[PDB]
Enzyme design. Structure first.
Site, PDB file in Angstrom:
ATOM      1  N   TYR A 124      31.745 -23.467  58.378  1.00 60.58           N
ATOM      2  CA  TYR A 124      30.956 -22.714  57.212  1.00 60.58           C
ATOM      3  C   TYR A 124      32.155 -22.205  56.092  1.00 60.58           C
ATOM      4  CZ  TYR A 124      27.358 -22.663  60.705  1.00 60.58           C
ATOM      5  OH  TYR A 124      26.483 -22.861  61.563  1.00 60.58           O
ATOM      6  N   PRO A 155      19.664 -21.911  55.768  1.00 62.53           N
ATOM      7  CA  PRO A 155      18.228 -22.085  56.274  1.00 62.53           C
ATOM      8  C   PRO A 155      17.309 -21.344  55.572  1.00 62.53           C
ATOM      9  CG  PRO A 155      20.108 -22.104  58.102  1.00 62.53           C
ATOM     10  CD  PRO A 155      20.463 -21.313  56.941  1.00 62.53           C
ATOM     11  N   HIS A 177      24.262 -19.092  56.692  1.00 59.01           N
ATOM     12  CA  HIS A 177      24.850 -19.354  58.071  1.00 59.01           C
ATOM     13  C   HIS A 177      26.012 -18.863  58.529  1.00 59.01           C
ATOM     14  CE1 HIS A 177      23.309 -21.332  61.357  1.00 59.01           C
ATOM     15  NE2 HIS A 177      22.924 -22.391  60.869  1.00 59.01           N
ATOM     16  N   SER A 208      17.043 -28.703  65.194  1.00 61.78           N
ATOM     17  CA  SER A 208      17.133 -27.580  65.769  1.00 61.78           C
ATOM     18  C   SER A 208      15.730 -26.928  66.011  1.00 61.78           C
ATOM     19  CB  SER A 208      17.938 -26.243  65.178  1.00 61.78           C
ATOM     20  OG  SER A 208      17.167 -26.032  63.999  1.00 61.78           O
TER      21      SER A 208
HETATM   22  C1  LIG Z   1      21.179 -26.415  60.840  1.00 58.62           C
HETATM   23  N1  LIG Z   1      22.237 -27.335  61.596  1.00 58.62           N
HETATM   24  C2  LIG Z   1      21.473 -27.949  62.599  1.00 58.62           C
HETATM   25  C3  LIG Z   1      22.729 -28.191  61.036  1.00 58.62           C
HETATM   26  C4  LIG Z   1      22.966 -26.316  62.120  1.00 58.62           C
HETATM   27  C5  LIG Z   1      22.501 -25.049  63.030  1.00 58.62           C
HETATM   28  O1  LIG Z   1      21.675 -24.186  62.298  1.00 58.62           O
HETATM   29  C6  LIG Z   1      23.465 -24.048  63.499  1.00 58.62           C
HETATM   30  C7  LIG Z   1      24.320 -24.968  64.710  1.00 58.62           C
HETATM   31  O2  LIG Z   1      23.836 -26.017  65.318  1.00 58.62           O
HETATM   32  O3  LIG Z   1      25.508 -24.649  64.765  1.00 58.62           O
END
Ligand SMILES: C[N+](C)(C)C[C@H](O)CC(=O)O
Length: 596
Positions: A78, A91, A314, A525
């Site tokens: 991030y 998200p 996130h 996910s």
């Molecule tokens: C959305 N995505 C699957 C890329 C990241 C997840 O929300 C968080 C993670 O899997 O670390």
């Protein structure tokens, strides 16, 4: 105290992880590439070799840190990611549409929502939040103390996160955004007791009356630009002590409530796709995108037509903690109403003004343009799978999640004629400060199944066996991932350790196979929630899809995203094949019961 009882994130054995890596590569790389990688892997882990030294480094790291992966993951996943957080990182969430049809109602609901969150916050501040277990094993609760009173802050090289939840004088106000205008609303009395939905409504009342018009610049849209750009614009925006004061209020607020403006009614068949856009990015400059501050960790959006939802940053957390709050709140907003005593002439919420300048205005226009392009390139398809939910897979003694993931592999193969690197989030919360690891859904067994499924030379009696083996394999991978035995974060750690040890980048990471392995055409996910909601996010690669789902008992909420810039992808088509894949798997299983 609860955290001190939690086991620490382990460092898997090198041989264990590399073996699983080779197995996961088989269905997605050529025979030649796999052979070459097999050689690199053997060399990499030989006794006294490079990998062994990096592995020892990780073991030392786990001995001197609470969680060997935490800082590295936060930075890599991030803080160092410079693309806009909008669509690409944060998200979005769509909650059950509410009934209210008028302004007083919207504010009524918004007011009820606020009280619900504070009720939840109580357990957080009081540390009375129920201890969760996965199955006899305690779960880390740290994520719950990062979502409130927090915010992402732009940085010239990498971003940072501020958290005021445990500061000297913790914030006692939330920020409300109406018509692009921010307000500082305190939700606690000097005595310490939080306001009631009534008193809060009275406050929200004054706020709406103090922002009845919309002719101000959408400063908030600045938070939706590239991080390198927003970093520069931010630094400038805060030169004025008034702006800095407002920005500071926003960053400190417990959370942000967005009272969105009415928007054009659309056809019912595309309504959900639109509501998803509004929750994820706002819809555009001339809609509700300016009625945001995407750096904010928790943004609750109460729309005009009754729809509601949220978007979260996130870096701050994961889905589960978010849904736990959502479930608690949506339920609270339904509780009865009794004691409605008359409050008092409560103080008025302070307005967070912004002094616009030609430079700031210019950045605002540059941001509008950037976001405009992003939105036009996003293809979203929301799918309510009504045929069945967790009920069917359970009736076959199959993990619903594994069943769903295998169906997606089938759908993908039916479209492209080959498997692709696939990512599925796995929760590592059984470990102290655990975040996530990767479950790879493209496997030797899933490829064997999708091929057998469409092969007319393979009898249904055999197809079903291949189906069962694929689901059990995914369930096994899932169980290992949640117990710290997956390999993706481990390999990432080995690479970062190499960088830190100042040693030449290991060949295993420069390998074509690794490149293919980390390019997730399918990023997914599962975010289960008691609330009939659904989350969504943009794909992680240009030619990929972002898929999220919430399996309910009798139906499944799916979200499918893709980029229009890539001709090879189409959300609607992927959604169609997914629905059919799920149906065909049910049919096949129904046709061949293990018994009778
Ligand atoms: C959305 N995505 C699957 C890329 C990241 C997840 O929300 C968080 C993670 O899997 O670390």
């Amino acid at each position: 105290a609860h955290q001190d009882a939690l086991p620490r994130l382990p460092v898997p054995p090198l041989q264990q992880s590399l073996d699983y890596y080779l197995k996961a590569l088989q269905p997605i790389v050529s025979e030649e590439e796999w052979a070459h990688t097999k050689q690199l892997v053997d060399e990499f882990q030989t006794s006294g070799g490079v990998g062994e030294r990096l592995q020892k480094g990780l073991e030392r790291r786990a001995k001197k840190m609470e969680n060997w992966l935490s800082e590295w993951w936060l930075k890599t996943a991030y803080l160092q990611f410079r693309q806009p957080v909008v669509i690409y990182s944060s998200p979005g969430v769509i909650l059950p549409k509410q009934d209210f049809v008028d302004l007083q109602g919207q504010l009524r609901f918004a007011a009820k929502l606020i009280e619900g969150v504070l009720d939840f916050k109580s357990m957080i501040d009081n540390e009375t939040l129920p201890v969760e277990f996965l199955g006899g094993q305690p779960l880390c609760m740290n994520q719950y103390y990062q979502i409130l009173s927090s915010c992402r802050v732009p940085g010239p090289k990498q971003d940072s996160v501020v958290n005021f939840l445990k500061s000297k004088r913790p914030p006692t106000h939330i920020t409300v955004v109406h018509n692009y205008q921010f307000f500082e609303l305190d939700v606690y009395h000097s005595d310490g007791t939080p306001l009631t939905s009534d008193q809060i409504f009275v406050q929200l009342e004054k706020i709406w009356n103090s922002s009845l018009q919309s002719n101000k610049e959408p400063v908030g849209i600045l938070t939706s630009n590239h991080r390198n750009t927003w970093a520069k614009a931010y630094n400038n925006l805060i030169k004025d002590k008034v702006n800095r004061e407002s920005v500071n209020s926003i960053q400190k607020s417990i959370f942000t409530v967005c009272l969105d403006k009415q928007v054009p009614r659309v056809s019912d068949d595309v309504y959900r796709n639109h509501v998803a856009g509004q929750m994820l990015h706002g819809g555009g400059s001339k809609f509700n995108s300016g009625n945001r501050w995407f750096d904010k960790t928790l943004q609750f959006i109460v729309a005009e037509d009754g729809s509601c939802g949220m978007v979260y940053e996130h870096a701050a957390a994961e889905g589960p903690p978010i849904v736990a709050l959502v479930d608690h709140v949506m339920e609270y907003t339904k509780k009865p109403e009794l004691v409605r005593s008359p409050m008092v002439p409560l103080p008025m919420p302070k307005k967070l003004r912004f002094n616009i300048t030609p430079e700031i205005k210019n950045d605002i226009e540059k941001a509008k343009q950037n976001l405009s392009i992003m939105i036009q390139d996003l293809d979203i398809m929301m799918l309510t799978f009504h045929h069945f939910g967790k009920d069917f897979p359970k009736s076959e003694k199959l993990s619903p999640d594994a069943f769903i993931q295998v169906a997606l592999q089938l759908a993908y193969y039916r479209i492209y004629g080959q498997a692709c690197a696939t990512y599925e989030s796995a929760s590592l919360r059984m470990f102290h400060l655990g975040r996530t690891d990767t479950i790879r859904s493209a496997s030797i067994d899933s490829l064997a199944f999708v091929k057998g499924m469409g092969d007319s030379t393979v009898p249904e009696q055999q197809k079903v066996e291949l189906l069962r083996k694929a689901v059990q394999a995914h369930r096994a991978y899932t169980d290992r991932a949640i117990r710290g035995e997956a390999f993706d974060r481990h390999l990432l750690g080995l690479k970062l350790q190499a960088i830190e040890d100042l040693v030449s980048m290991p060949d295993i990471f420069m390998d074509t196979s690794y490149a293919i392995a980390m390019h997730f055409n399918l990023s997914t996910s599962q975010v289960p929630a008691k609330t009939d909601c659904v989350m969504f996010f943009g794909p992680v690669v240009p030619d990929g899809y972002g898929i999220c789902y919430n399996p309910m008992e009798a139906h499944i909420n799916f979200s499918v995203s893709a980029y229009n810039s890539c001709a090879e992808t189409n959300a609607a088509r992927m959604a169609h094949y997914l629905e059919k894949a799920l149906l065909d798997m049910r049919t096949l299983l129904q046709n061949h019961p293990r018994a009778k």
